[PDB]
Design a protein around this ligand. Sequence first.
Ligand SMILES: COc1ccc(CN2CCc3c(c(C(=O)N[C@@H](CC(=O)O)c4ccccc4)nn3CCO)C2)c2ccccc12
Length: 63
Amino acid sequence: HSEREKRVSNAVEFLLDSRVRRTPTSSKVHFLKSKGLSAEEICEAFTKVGQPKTLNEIKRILS
Ligand SMILES: COc1ccc(CN2CCc3c(c(C(=O)N[C@@H](CC(=O)O)c4ccccc4)nn3CCO)C2)c2ccccc12
């Protein structure tokens, strides 16, 4: 995997965890950015797990 793919893969695994799934979106977004994910990478991970968010929602959290 590329480093980007590893970031997204790690985010996917995170977002699937049952406790995580009960955490609000905002805190997960801020978490994922702290891990070094861009907004686009975060948006990709949310879509890969079937919890899709707009880019604009993600950028509003991060703003
Ligand atoms: C912001 O909210 C939270 C952050 C962290 C944790 C603890 N872990 C929950 C489960 C979890 C974590 C991580 C995690 O931190 N992964 C890192 C990579 C690593 O350390 O192996 C990571 C890196 C980059 C992007 C996302 C995740 N992965 N997973 C799933 C696999 O066990 C972190 C939470 C636990 C419960 C509820 C909310 C949590």
